[PDB]
Amino acid sequence: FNILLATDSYKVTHYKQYPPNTSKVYSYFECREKVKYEETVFYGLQYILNKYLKGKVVTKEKIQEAKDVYKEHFQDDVFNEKGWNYILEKYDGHLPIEIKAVPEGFVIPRGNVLFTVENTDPECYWLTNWIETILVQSWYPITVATNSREQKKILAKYLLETSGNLDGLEYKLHDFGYRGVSSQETAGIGASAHLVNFKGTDTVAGLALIKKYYGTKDPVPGYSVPAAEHSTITAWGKDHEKDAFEHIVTQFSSVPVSVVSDSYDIYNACEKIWGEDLRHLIVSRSTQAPLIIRPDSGNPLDTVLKVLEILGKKFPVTENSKGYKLLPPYLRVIQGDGVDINTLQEIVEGMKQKMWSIENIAFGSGGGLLQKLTRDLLNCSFKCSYVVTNGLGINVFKDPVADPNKRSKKGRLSLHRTPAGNFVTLEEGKGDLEEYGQDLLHTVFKNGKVTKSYSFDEIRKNAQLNIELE
Amino acid sequence: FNILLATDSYKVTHYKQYPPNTSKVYSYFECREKKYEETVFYGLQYILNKYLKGKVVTKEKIQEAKDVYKEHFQDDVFNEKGWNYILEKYDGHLPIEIKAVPEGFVIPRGNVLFTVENTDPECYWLTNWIETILVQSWYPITVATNSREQKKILAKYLLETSGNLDGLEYKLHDFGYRGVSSQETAGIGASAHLVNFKGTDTVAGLALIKKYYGTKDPVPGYSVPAAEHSTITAWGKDHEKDAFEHIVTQFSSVPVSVVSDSYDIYNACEKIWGEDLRHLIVSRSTQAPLIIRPDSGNPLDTVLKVLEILGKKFPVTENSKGYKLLPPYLRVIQGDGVDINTLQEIVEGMKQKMWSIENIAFGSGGGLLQKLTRDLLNCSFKCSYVVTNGLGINVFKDPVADPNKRSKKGRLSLHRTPAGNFVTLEEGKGDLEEYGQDLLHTVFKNGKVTKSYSFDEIRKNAQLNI
Ligand SMILES: O=C(NCc1cccnc1)Nc1ccc(CN2C(=O)c3ccccc3C2=O)cc1
Ligand SMILES: O=C(NCc1cccnc1)Nc1ccc(CN2C(=O)c3ccccc3C2=O)cc1
Structure with a gap:
């Protein structure tokens, strides 16, 4: 298993596409709103984190193997060899990523944030959406x-x-x-x-x-x-x-x-x-x-x-x-x-x-x-919602004119339980106001380590x- | 990976279910006739190489299966003797024979794509143990x-x-x-x-x-x-x-x-x-x-x-x-x-x-x-032939409510017809070779991949x- 070969091919080319001077790419996962499945059971992330994401997931062999395949796959040199070498040298092959997630087993209504992904190192702004394929x-x-x-x-x-x-x-x-x-x-x-x-x-x-x-x-x-x-x-x-x-x-x-x-x-x-x-x-x-x-x-x-x-x-x-x-x-x-x-x-x-x-x-x-x-039964979707370019944080989203159901959230997100027991995903960092109590997402992954099981x-x-509870 | 833990639970209990004195269980795979008039035979080699070839049975794998199943059934029903036999007699190599149509072949529906049988009578139960992985x-x-x-x-x-x-x-x-x-x-x-x-x-x-x-x-x-x-x-x-x-x-x-x-x-x-x-x-x-x-x-x-x-x-x-x-x-x-x-x-x-x-x-x-x-091409694995008390019988299912669920009888073979098309011969009739040689080559025999x-x-x- 090589993480460098465990993404969609076009993601290899993405580091060249983001706005220049991007230090942060923050993305989230939800089961978008539309048998009607009004609420979902969050399960399975721990398995992915343990089996594929934790520890030294990068070696010099995994970097050379990926480089050889992509040169042939693309019939061109697009592969970010420098970027991957940076992770191997600075972090000893450990991913500078932080994943915040709702606890496993939790039953959350549709259209709420279940987990978020972001890079912990500015050089690895491209890493957030590289791991989209495996997380989705x-x-x-x-x-x-x-x-x-x-x-x-x-x-x-x-x-x-x-x-x-x-x-x-x-x-x-x-x-x-x-x-x-x-x-x-x-x-x-x-x-x-x-x-x-x-x-x-x-x-x-x-x-x-x-x-x-x-x-x-x-x-x-x-x-x-x-x-x-x-x-x-x-x-x-x-x-x-x-x-x-x-x-x-x-x-x-x-x-x-x-x-x-x-x-x-x-x-x-x-x-x-x-x-x-x-x-x-x-x-x-x-x-x-x-x-x-x-x-x-x-x-x-x-x-x-x-x-x-x-x-x-x-x-x-x-x-x-x-x-x-x-x-x-x-x-x-x-x-x-x-x-x-x-x-x-x-x-x-x-x-x-x-x-x-x-x-x-x-x-x-x-x-x-x-x-x-x-994947479309629950509309399980992973999207970028927040970016930091030239030190300025911007709320990012998509809003396709023909499909309003494909509209994604803006900015920094947090999930909260209201006093009446309803669920709220607070957009644009509004959760920093602490109006709906503690955010339901907990760090489960940070810098190559499983932080919460x-x-x-x-x-x-x-x-x-x-x-069952009666 | 442990092949002993790579089957449907119920298949752990089948050795106790077959007729007494059964020396052979022979089974076949087909894309049953119900749009998709012909199928591409692809993927068996991946399964053969990754999961069935070589020493797949060890003392530890037998022990792990025994411990799990004891708890899983809340009863000791695991065939420890049966698997221990494969370990000693064959050094964990599966005494099985798989004959299949060449990979990439485009075959019409309702034709034998591949067959499975035990090469040792003590392993009559083995044929259908591996159905899950093969299906x-x-x-x-x-x-x-x-x-x-x-x-x-x-x-x-x-x-x-x-x-x-x-x-x-x-x-x-x-x-x-x-x-x-x-x-x-x-x-x-x-x-x-x-x-x-x-x-x-x-x-x-x-x-x-x-x-x-x-x-x-x-x-x-x-x-x-x-x-x-x-x-x-x-x-x-x-x-x-x-x-x-x-x-x-x-x-x-x-x-x-x-x-x-x-x-x-x-x-x-x-x-x-x-x-x-x-x-x-x-x-x-x-x-x-x-x-x-x-x-x-x-x-x-x-x-x-x-x-x-x-x-x-x-x-x-x-x-x-x-x-x-x-x-x-x-x-x-x-x-x-x-x-x-x-x-x-x-x-x-x-x-x-x-x-x-x-x-x-x-x-x-x-x-x-x-x-x-699996329903799109009606992909099915069924037992078509057994040898009980040394006498071979053609076996099959024929449910009253579903004639599409009816399976083939006896030993099967695939032949090219004079017009260059395909035919599946039943009840061992392929031995007469009226339409030439069987198109199904041995791809697997006794823990070995014989054809790639x-x-x-x-x-x-x-x-x-x-
Ligand atoms: O769309 C995408 N990726 C997005 C994606 C990726 C993964 C998941 N989800 C969305 N990739 C793309 C790939 C091949 C082609 C086909 N193609 C042409 O039409 C063409 C014309 C002339 C020369 C060569 C070509 C060619 O190779 C088109 C697009
Ligand atoms: O049918 C089968 N396997 C065939 C199969 C297997 C795999 C693929 N394809 C067909 N297994 C079976 C398993 C559990 C149950 C549930 N169950 C009851 O109904 C019951 C009633 C009273 C006491 C305890 C029980 C109980 O545990 C029933 C059947």
Whole structure:
């Protein structure tokens, strides 16, 4: 990893473009104002700061390597070899940058400053926007954590309306997204961000990331259960789906087990295989070891409804204290297909309309949870707001005539909590008046060092829902 | 990196699930038939080299997996014996065989792209353990395919409006570094775009290619100097002309891309470029033009509005195909909201307004490298064949509610047909070689990469017919 090769190519050319005699470039990150995502979960910066920004990130080899690539890439000598050599000589390869950030886990309304970046040495005025590319990648854990939390709000609302409590809320949205993501690094990042709101993951990669960069009092940040896949059912032969089912439930008779039931026919598997042929191996299972029937195809809500009506006619359905239908404690369902924030809302609402409790279901989400997300969902944006040229500080911004939503903030910024509990980003250095109490941004990075860290437990507490706090 | 911790949790429990006395689990990858009629096979070599080759199992890695999984499942279900076996018998080298179509090959949907099987019966569970890591090849495949499809659109309209395909390799530039989920994804995605084009800003893609593939050229991708909002806006709202002037003067010998929408795109094209600094543009070389970059508003409407302005302030000719062409020292780049749908809308809208495609280049970020899923090409890995009690059976899924989710049966092979097209043979029928030899070469066997391809080879295989 070479930081000199970890920026957009045009940024190599930027030191020649700023006004001459520029000593300071001060930039900020926000999730611009426009399912509506009124508030965001700030998560993921600590990982970027530790893995890519801290310490001696510049060597004489990294400088020569970058110089060789750019001479070929640009078919010209644009690379600021002097500027990078200055950091190696004066700071021993440490970045003369200061990053102020809102605490990780914090839930902030859209259109507020979440972090700021500035150079601590006038010679490195160009360094502020060099590191934009790598810092803006924080849109991803921010976005995964916000959308995951938004799904938690739906799940918490419906579990409370149908059962009167939130038992098992942190295990109702499982991460199945490991194969559907673009890389091993993305898998670890995305899974850690879902782990801010939930405890269930199959993306093993996220456990190591939390352990390495955040830390938990608990041994592991995420848990899972044994489960079948199509290969372990179909491997038995079409006529032996019953034997596959029976072998798997016997092998995991004392822990919960998820068995994919749609390999040939989900309805027949529920009605005849689970409902009749092996009914005797289900009704015997413990409350702590249920069979979780997994449909994996067709219309998500239509399938969940039919599956529940089938199991209702084969197994004893009771009624909870809220008057909702409950499958016996040794029988549950998981819908791990076509699940996204939109279909999740549709299924729980469809189940509630049919008087089925949400205690009955869990959800699995892959691509919808970790991949089908973009930087534009939250309008995650990094912009220059303040510059010092010829010793004179100027408020800088953009304001495209065709898009007022692309209007950025002016000057030195600070985030504050109002007495009524609202959030305010004070522009043009107005925060120096101390009218709204202490600024919510804290220095997390300064001169190659991580100055402030957060544990995964702290993040989790900061990201808690209001329903959870009651 | 620990491969034992690089799978879906449930796959840790599968060894206890297969039929007793299973000596073989054979699986295959395909881009299931559902627009994207053919896919570019790209990216497996990166996965093979970085993650599966050599001693990937150690006593420590077994211990780390055992400790993690014990806590993860709140039960000891990890196959410690199974992995310890690979450690002792093979010195941590995976007893697996991967047969794949040559990288860069353009194959129609619903065809076997690659197969996976255990070379040792004790490792029947291994085949699907590595599904997770291998399925991630959906990403370079999908990126290379969607990039190739955009080149086909660009090829069609450039040929219609100009008469040639000059500078096609530089018409779709990569701006996606910031908008991807990680540094790894940046390198992976950018490398997959470079299979079809030469212009990238995602620097990470160059080192990946160099390390895993190789080019005769020193670099696989190129760029030009360009402004961003900060380099403009840092001059002050009253000094946008000054910013523009300084930038074009600093890069007077190379093409320079200058973002023109910081305040008013229409005024910057009409007044700043078209009047105040017009003397600094008309002097520029054909090999070093000014590239005006709008970055907001409706993509098609903004492009047409920008071109209409420049056409009034600069001399426009009518090319050999009857299409309007800006002077050679002046070009445009649309790098906002560009995906395969909007690119097609822009090139068709330009053609309709009699503007040539020689005038335009496209910049694509999130649409190029991020706004893509495994569902776009229906990328799937499934078990098609098992050997239980020494008898081989053809295995498959056939869900009642989704016939598209039906998978292939038995041992698979890929053949070239007499008409020069492709066919996937099922149930071991490929052994008869009616359409010649299997096109799937062994790329991986027992911790070894047995067959490699250079990026130049991949680029040659992925070429358009035109
Ligand atoms: O389905 C699967 N894996 C398949 C897979 C994995 C990866 C990719 N693609 C498909 N795993 C599974 C995991 C957690 C749960 C949640 N869960 C319950 O519903 C439940 C009810 C009662 C007690 C405890 C629990 C519980 O922990 C359910 C299923
Ligand atoms: O816009 C930008 N960077 C901004 C950016 C960068 C990263 C992220 N986000 C915004 N770069 C740019 C790059 C290539 C081209 C294409 N191009 C031409 O049109 C042309 C005409 C004649 C000679 C050579 C060329 C050429 O190479 C155009 C622009």
